[PDB]
């Protein structure tokens, strides 16, 4: 009936400890989720067009064009690591743990109240409204992960959140032609519509079974099961120059400090090894043939255009290029108590070594004579096109069969846990947004709404929008989240990089004289590993 | 449903006589809880100076410099006799039983009411609305025993009740060098900040299992079992003729057993035993003189030299009329300490009714021999502290960008706690050819037992350990 | 739920003839009760003493000097004729019946509606507030025969009824030197406080469990069964004794008060559209060991006293239950209380106002033995309503025979 | 719970037909019942005279002294043709049947709504209020037969109805000696209140057990089957006389003596409102009216045969006399329950009390301003035999026709008829 609850909050996270060196790690996460009825109930088309700050020669990064399907609908998306753990929890994960493991997600909504606002104010409870609940089981609408806005569930236990309004990309075709400030005249800066070879709209009601929950009821989502592969919870260090066997040194120092440096016996051109350089005797710790490559010198800051306008190309590893920049709100980390819209910011500078340094690179000719001129070595302080500000590492690539990289590591507490793999032929090596991809399906998206609560006046012919009673919803929502994965071991003779609280980070993990709480990025690979 | 009512208040107290001379006294209480919304639904981490106070010179003792986690949760709290026990049982108890054994306690919160407020008042019912409440059988959060703020569920079975608004202490460090009246100037009175070695931050919601409760539910605490050992009712006659500083500032030496000092003073309100048509808000208090003997005098204690000559003379005998340090006020017997390896003691007697039943033991290593603010001592574990807080209920116009506290519809409850405590006691028997001092009501203490013409209650201490035993 | 009945009224009166000239007269009685909050929600303790009149000399018999524990719960007793048969049912009885014995009762409160006022006046129904019930099976609390203070369940099956605020007696000690007109001076008159030997405090709560029913729920007493000893429908004065607690009239055991007086309102026989303070009155003259009963008014049963000898009659019930008699049904509105409560400041805790109605239902079991009254033109207005919706029971006797 | 629907809507007349010519007719009829509170929760004993309308000389038939108990109780009677068959099915009961058995009755009130008024006037739901529902199965209650005071539930499935508030006569004793225009001296013209040996003062309260139901109760009462002698829809037409418009006196007025055969006098006039059949959308108090001419010759002109059904505002039952010896027939109704008949179901909605009640002021009580609708369902069986044209010449029917047209079929402004149709159609051989 009306007055017997329906499910427990529950936001504690079990470590369960099975044979061999393996922990069930089971991350339950509990909301009240606060839901206003949409703005209107109708199936919107909106094209965003910036031709105004785009315009402006120099602006062309800036292009927000899109078209969206505005949808009356609201996700409930908790695919974010802060959803789920406390900092207390991901310590005890990154400090102790060498690789993780998905395995299942499940979700529930239960003790739905509904309450309708009448003018001073006056709430009164809504026994025989509805929420409208859908779950996208198949994946026949659109992915959208929420945590590329900051868009996903509160990571805070005790604080209400909210579900995004959903929508999802149109078709639309532009072009941008670049140009710099002090450019002639105004570049082909136009909107060209919509292919109709490419229209799809998709709605929640034509695809999906929706339930009509009232008050008394829950949805529950079967136990989805994952398939991925290991995100490993440890960086390598090895660089190239760091693969296989040192020279041996025949002039070992004899006295402590750094001014004693140990030499090798022996010239360089008549030391001993395998040089991939055919017509060059100088074996060094440049030239000498290592197993592969890792990493890979990729154009940095480099847009590309295709029919939808120009993009960033991605890239796998940064050194600030490459690495992630969030930026995130008061619900996902920053100092609740501060004014202002302006979101807190960090920059994710991995660990790992698979990344480029571009000043130190260069490219010299085949002849190789060793004291190389000016004219046979191609600097990054030489320009390309004339150009000052570009020189070749701006323009250059790099990757190829030898190429050797690491996933993404997990980014605390803003970053995607899991991702839906491509329905391309060819499907790419990595995501650059999360450590886990879904390989042939992924959880399905929870899309939440309020019924339409009438007037009297109602007329469907009338032209205007549809009077509707002001309503608004709380349901609690119930997540588990369940992860497998193995305990380290202290090869090393040294102990490793650890997480701890500090003098300095102290105040960041307690609340405030007045409350406020904030949850600062935590580094999610701190053990080294081994890369050969 | 709704209308269904949840279960049964039931107050009683039971003797159910067992064979070879043991009774189960089982008490049942139950109270009807009011619980208002928090004051503000995040947690908050506080810290309380008053270098204000410290500062003038000779108020060192007056320290209440500490930092606190203030948080939403209340706590329903049992752990008092008053709670459970009425005079005229405490009687019985005292006057017939031998020694008192724990047994079993257990909860239930039934027939939970949610209502809001809409401005005049007008009074409306939520029956979509939910209490959360919370067990936390394993004893994951800080202990925190309400009886020593006198905080606990009222002594009275028809009053209502509140539960207290629940916080535990956070680390800090300090330092307040100590200094008299005329010191030449401001001693070393700071506070340092907290320790990052020490820091622990916790939540009901990321240790506990919340239960939601709408007005339809029930949630009954399982019985959980004790095994503590006896409590004796009866003191010892026999004697043998037959402040200190660490991190977080200074702090007391407690004693075990006093005369004067080392006699508990308790200071309690109106739910708990002041006369409830009193006015002001000056509490009613009393001090604990037991009747235990065992506590030594230090007016008459005196030290002398080996040599052991009858007539001392002066250099050979140390009194406590003496001055140590030179001060006129102070002698050896504020320094001196004889606990050793011959020392024997009793465990503190019951103080009905604002004493406490039990205490967690402490996870030292190293146990303490007695604690004082108990009689019985749960080694193993000890009940679980139950939580409540009733859940938001948010108005349409919530953003959880804004940084102002959130709206919230003024929300209130009244929900329904009963308890059910056994005991096991032994029946008493007459060694002795004169009878013992019982307690009962007489001319002079007649009135404090039945109410007045406005209907004031008060519950007057009663003495646990009435009758005497043999020490040796 | 909340919409489902959980019970049936009855009034009906079955007479069940068995072997032998033996007949079961089966009364089932059911009655509207409304209950008010308490007055206030604590035990008082008040003392009533009136010097301002019995210090008047020849005043010694005015003597209304007692203690009291005023208690918030109020008592449903069915403790008396009225409540039961109807003057045809009487007749029937009286006229047929030789000897009658009492076999068993039970009580159930079903329909418990719970309301609240908000102030003109809107009634606010509150499907979550409770009312407690409780009821004393092993007879913990003091006796409290409702029927000598006129305050049993009202008489007409139509008519709603109250229960009565319950009270019992606290210990006091008085003496008063009676003194006659033209007496010299004052004699003694004082009032001495309580002897702590007598103390008793009992509380509801305490004593006997407590069912705090919402709205959707019921509770039924057991069935109770009597040992009485048949009853039979065939035929110094002025003395005042002191006791500790005061003067009292000793009871004189047969008639010509002197024969019982009963004075009553208009729940309990007076005619109902008739106005003023003043009660219904009349002195019963039986024919006439053992008492008659007196309808309406007249208790049914008594319980025997604890003491060691017991007396041999009771001059105000037939019966008189030896072992132990039904247990009494107390009942309270429960607090529904406000957002602004602070249980430690002094006044008095504010309530919402709130007030119950609830159907009380009885079943009453007699066995009688077959071995006169009649209407009349003098008494035939007695028996029918007036024009004005009017109605009375007046007294009928009962040791016909 | 509340809100769980109990029962479901019924208003089919349904034709089973059973070879050797037998048709079982089962009239489903299904109302939405309003009931108010009642004016008082007291049983009132009035005294009705009107001396000074007979005082005027030859005035005795309009005599109208009783005595009554007005009761809170109100009574839902479905006693009456009208209630159960709509015009059509009449005309086939009427054009090809011969004669009627009654086989049972039962009822249902279902659907209960309880509500409050608050003063403009809003309105509230009450789930805690309750409605009393008595049934009189033994027939202790005086038998109140609504048909004659035009108090049957109403005959359209559509417009809801409401039920009569119940009362019942009491004892009284009245002389009233005849007199004409140009008597000298003022006749005796007295009322001598009442004589014990007659008073019953009735109460459903110690005389029926009462259901308490609250929302989503239903009382489905039992089914009651009858044992009447047929009643037969064929007209002798090859006979008894009386004194024309006589008036016997007993100890209660001047009474008629009724007349068992017609042709004016013994042919019954009917007076009904809008709800038994009157033009709905007319206005006034006057009621509408006909003279049942039945078409049977067994009257004479200044077992003998039965009363003819007269739909739809005549009775269908009525209660055999509890004398000793017992009239041969009715004059009302054609079935007589023999010796038990169906119990009569008093419907009241509980006291819904005021915080202010004191049962010792002689004051009338102050109770909220409730009101119930609820739904009543019955289900009254026929078993009747198909005629036979033994003649050779074709029969009188009833018909649609160019006059009649329009008394079957609603106005323009929603108004709604039932006009009286004969019953008793085919000729019978004596």
């Known amino acids: 009936g009306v007055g017997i609850s329906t499910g427990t909050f529950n936001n504690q996270t079990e470590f369960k400890f099975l044979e061999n060196g393996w922990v069930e790690i089971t991350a339950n996460s509990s909301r009240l989720v606060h839901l206003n009825m949409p703005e209107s109930e109708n199936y919107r088309r909106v094209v965003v067009n910036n031709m105004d700050k785009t315009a402006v020669n120099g602006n062309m990064a800036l ?15 908790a695919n974010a690591w802060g959803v789920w753990f406390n900092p207390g929890d991901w310590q005890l994960i990154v400090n102790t743990m060498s690789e993780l493991h998905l395995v299942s997600f499940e979700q529930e909504i239960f003790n739905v109240v509904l309450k309708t606002v009448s003018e ?99 949805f529950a989502t079967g136990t989805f099961f994952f398939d991925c592969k290991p995100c490993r919870l440890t960086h390598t260090w090895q660089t190239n120059r760091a693969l296989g066997l040192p020279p041996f040194l025949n002039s070992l120092p004899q006295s402590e400090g750094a001014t004693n440096f140990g030499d090798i016996g022996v010239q360089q051109d008549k030391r001993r090894g395998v040089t991939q350089m055919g017509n060059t005797n100088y074996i060094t710790e440049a030239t000498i043939m290592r197993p592969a490559e890792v990493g890979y010198s990729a154009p940095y800051y480099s847009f590309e255009a295709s029919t939808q306008g120009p993009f960033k190309t991605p890239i796998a590893a940064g050194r600030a290029d490459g690495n992630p920049r969030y930026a995130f709100g008061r619900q996902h980390g920053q100092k609740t108590t501060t004014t202002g819209e302006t979101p807190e910011r960090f920059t994710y500078i991995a660990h790992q070594d698979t990344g480029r340094y571009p000043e130190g690179d260069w490219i010299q000719n085949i002849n190789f004579n060793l004291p190389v001129t000016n004219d046979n070595v191609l600097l990054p302080t030489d320009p390309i096109g004339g150009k000052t500000g570009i020189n070749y590492t701006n ?76 309503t608004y919803s709380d349901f609690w929502w119930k997540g588990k989240l369940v992860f497998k994965a193995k305990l380290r071991a202290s090869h090393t003779w040294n102990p490793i990089q650890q997480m701890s609280i500090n003098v300095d ?11 406020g709480m904030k949850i600062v990025y935590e580094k999610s690979q701190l053990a080294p590993r081994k890369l050969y």
């Open 395 to 470: 323009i250059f690539n790099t990757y190829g069969p030898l190429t050797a990289l690491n996933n993404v590591p997990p980014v605390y507490p803003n970053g995607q846990i899991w991702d839906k793999e491509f329905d391309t032929d060819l499907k790419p090596r990595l995501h650059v947004n999360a450590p886990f991809v879904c390989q042939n399906n992924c959880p399905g998206q929870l899309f939440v709404k309020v019924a339409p609560n009438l007037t009297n006046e109602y007329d469907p012919d009338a032209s205007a929008n549809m009077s509707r009673i002001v």
């Open 120 to 218: 001073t104010k006056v709430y009164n409870n809504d026994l025989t409204a509805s929420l409208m609940v859908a779950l996208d089981s198949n994946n026949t609408m659109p992915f959208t992960p929420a945590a590329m806005r900051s868009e996903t569930l509160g990571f805070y236990p005790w604080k209400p959140t909210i579900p995004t309004p959903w929508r999802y990309y149109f078709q639309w075709d532009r072009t941008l032609i670049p140009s710099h400030t002090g450019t002639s005249g105004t570049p082909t800066n136009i909107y060209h519509g919509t292919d109709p070879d490419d229209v799809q709209f998709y709605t929640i009601e034509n695809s999906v079974p929706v339930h009509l929950l009232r008050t008394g009821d829950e």
């Open 63 to 77: 292009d927000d064009i899109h078209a969206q399907i505005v949808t009356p609908w609201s996700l409930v998306d």
């Open 505 to 515: 980070n102290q105040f960041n993990y307690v609340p405030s004289n007045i409350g």
